[PDB]
Amino acid sequence: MYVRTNLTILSPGWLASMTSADGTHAYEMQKSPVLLVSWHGKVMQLKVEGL
């Protein structure tokens, strides 16, 4: 799974990580039906579908 966002992924780890000059974060990692991030000091969960 390849994911592009501007959040900060915490839960599942990853292998490939890169960031643009504008803080956009791109990751490549193993498939997982979920993610967990922190927004502004609040932990939130993201549901991944389509698997």
């Binding site: 900060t8 915490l10 990580s17 960031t19 922190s38 927004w39 502004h40 000091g41 609040k42 932990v43």
Partner: protein, 140 residues
């Protein structure tokens, strides 16, 4: 003549009980580890030398944050009306900070942040020019 005992509360939960049973042992182990570490290594000084409090630092705060650092310290500086500077560079691995308290002032809050950062980063203050300087750990 009704007979009872003082503590009567709402019913508990067995899973919570088991969680507490684990947690008490974990906490005791951590306490013993901290004690032995303090014994083996004698501390020398304190960060308050490099982070001395001053006026207008007594405006109080209460936070609950368990995420990154940069925006948190930037908001703190903006509230304090202090010029923010960053030295070093943010590494690819993010530096995460978990903090939860109530009614702690700026000086001790910043000291706790610095201690929790430990080896990854450091904080310094300059009341002469109202400067908050955050320095990363440049190694390798």
């Amino acid at each position: 003549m009704k007979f009872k005992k003082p503590p009567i509360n709402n019913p508990s939960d067995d899973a919570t009980i088991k969680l507490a049973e684990a947690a008490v042992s974990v906490s005791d182990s951590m306490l013993e580890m901290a004690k032995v570490e303090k014994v083996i290594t004698p501390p020398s000084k304190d960060n308050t030398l490099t982070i001395p409090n001053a006026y207008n630092l007594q405006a109080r705060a209460s936070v609950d944050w368990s995420g990154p650092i940069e925006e948190l310290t930037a908001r703190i500086a903006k509230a304090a009306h202090f010029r923010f500077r960053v030295l070093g560079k943010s590494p690819s691995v993010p530096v995460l900070i978990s903090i939860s308290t109530k009614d702690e002032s700026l000086a001790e809050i910043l000291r706790d942040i610095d201690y929790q950062a430990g080896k990854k980063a450091s904080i310094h203050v300059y009341p002469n020019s109202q400067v908050v300087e955050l320095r990363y750990a440049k190694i390798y």
